Design a protein around this ligand. Structure first.
Ligand SMILES: CN1/C(=C/c2sc3ccccc3[n+]2CCCS(=O)(=O)O)Oc2ccccc21
Lengths: 224, 212
RNA sequence: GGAUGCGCCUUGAAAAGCCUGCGAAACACGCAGCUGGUGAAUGACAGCUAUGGCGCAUCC
């Protein structure tokens, strides 16, 4: 079997005025017999349709805000669709999704599968990896809270898990905030039973791909 | 270009409420309209296609309707996991266009935050900056006042807040406030406190620690 | 997995154009026949044959 999948790649930080290409690797169907669309979402903003390519003919369509700078294409041998972006501007910063227009018979012209999305940040600024500091539980609602602070990184995003993924209950990973330094920071917290602070281990796994930073920080109480 | 405009742009409704969202095309589009649900930072999920057909696997509480150039998404009885931004989209003519989105928030009963305070780590202190973190956990409504005090003086301009998305089961929020100080200033003072005011608290709740 | 049975889709409309169903199908490309109905410019079709699919039920 081959399950239908769309896997996007190519996102990251790029200087303005340059060129960057996104890829959308399809599995489970034949990409040249389907319609593929690109749709983007600027942080905090709405969905914006960007471009599409038609099955069998390969006819291409574009939004005005994008026409003449972007080129959508498909490669049958790679089963992969592409969005080539040229003369990048800050207004192009967004999460970019590829999507498959579904089967007319089953879903009309609705988009039935989507990629995971990938962030393109168009900025002159440089890449900085994060520092990861513990948020230790205190000595004093029945439970205890602990976490880790992920400070001074750029660009977005960062991913945080706890105990390699074994700890998901009670986790809150906050939206990043842009500091006045122009770097991001965020915290991830989890609430756990106070009785288990001596016994259970709590490790915060932080990944910042644009800087190849992988960190695992243990979080224990202070001796005091 | 065809323009799609949803109303309202945001709404708050209780569990079990009937919610109706409307979307108007500026030109004709002949029911080539789909509705999507998007959780924050996640890919949208198709709900309705061809104006009124329920997509395979979508719960029956979602329906779509057409009347001329006006299209309606109905949630028959709102569920806590329905918190999201909902988008209409026309695919009658290129370029395709999405509506601006309507954000749906779950209205629930008042829930008071649990407050935690976190001193900077020695590890960070070696670096010349100190971050003090105040956590407001699992509260409703979203509006809350966090005030930092250092040796009983009110702080201003040196904190930032972030708030989670609504929880998918209990519809509550959590909030972090981070106070940023130079190591120099941090070492000059003893008492660090965050005072929280919220509808669910009869009087402000203060969490503090003494440096050292 | 094997048998059988039921249902459904496999357009409609014609000079042009427009609209519309199906073919993975918004543009481009492709879509056989019968009986009745409709059209003096109107999608308006009903029941089927053939060819390709799809779902449900029974039975071993
Ligand atoms: C060509 N033409 C046309 C022909 C018409 S109207 C009509 C009405 C009832 C029955 C037959 C019929 N017929 C011909 C049938 C032959 S066939 O098309 O079935 O092969 O009417 C037109 C009006 C405006 C412009 C051109 C027109």
């Amino acid at each position: 079997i081959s399950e239908v999948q769309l896997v996007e790649s190519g996102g990251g930080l790029v200087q303005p005025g340059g060129s960057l290409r996104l890829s959308c690797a399809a599995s489970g169907f034949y990409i040249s017999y389907s319609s593929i669309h690109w749709v983007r979402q600027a942080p905090g903003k709405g969905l914006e349709w960007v471009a599409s390519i038609s099955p069998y003919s390969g006819s291409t369509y574009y939004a005005d805000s994008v026409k003449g700078r972007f080129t959508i294409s498909a490669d049958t041998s790679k089963n992969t669709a592409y969005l080539q972006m040229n003369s990048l501007r800050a207004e192009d910063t967004a999460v970019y999704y590829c999507a498959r227009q579904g089967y007319r018979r089953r879903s009309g012209r609705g988009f039935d599968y989507w990629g995971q999305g990938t962030l393109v940040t168009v900025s002159s600024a440089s890449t900085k990896g994060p520092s990861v500091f513990p948020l230790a539980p205190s000595s004093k609602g029945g439970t205890a809270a602990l976490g880790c602070l992920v400070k001074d990184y750029f660009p977005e995003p960062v991913t945080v898990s706890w105990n390699s993924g074994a700890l998901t209950s009670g986790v809150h990973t906050f939206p990043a905030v842009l500091q006045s330094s122009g770097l991001y920071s965020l915290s991830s917290v989890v609430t756990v039973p106070s009785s288990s602070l001596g016994t259970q281990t709590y490790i915060c796994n932080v990944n910042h791909k644009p800087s190849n930073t992988k960190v695992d920080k243990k979080v224990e109480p202070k001796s005091c | 270009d065809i323009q799609m405009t949803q109303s309202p742009s945001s709404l708050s409704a209780s569990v079990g409420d009937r919610v109706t969202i409307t979307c108007r095309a500026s030109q004709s589009v002949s029911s080539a309209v789909a509705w999507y649900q998007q959780k924050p930072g996640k890919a949208p999920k198709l709900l309705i296609y061809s104006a009124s057909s329920l997509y395979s696997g979508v719960p029956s509480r979602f329906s779509g309707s057409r009347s001329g150039t006006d299209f309606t998404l109905t949630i028959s009885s709102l569920q806590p996991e329905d918190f999201a931004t909902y988008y209409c989209q026309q695919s009658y003519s290129f370029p395709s266009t999405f509506g601006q989105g309507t954000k749906v928030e779950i209205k629930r009963t008042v829930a008071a935050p649990s407050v935690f305070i976190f001193p900077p780590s020695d590890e960070q202190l070696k670096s010349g900056t100190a971050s003090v973190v105040c956590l407001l956990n699992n509260f409703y409504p979203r509006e809350a006042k966090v005030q930092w005090k250092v040796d009983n003086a009110l702080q201003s301009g040196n904190s930032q807040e972030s708030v989670t998305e609504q929880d998918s089961k209990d519809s509550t929020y959590s909030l972090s406030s981070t106070l940023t100080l130079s190591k120099a200033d941090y070492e000059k003072h003893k008492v660090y406190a965050c005072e929280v005011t919220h509808q669910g608290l009869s009087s402000p709740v203060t969490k503090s620690f003494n440096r050292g």
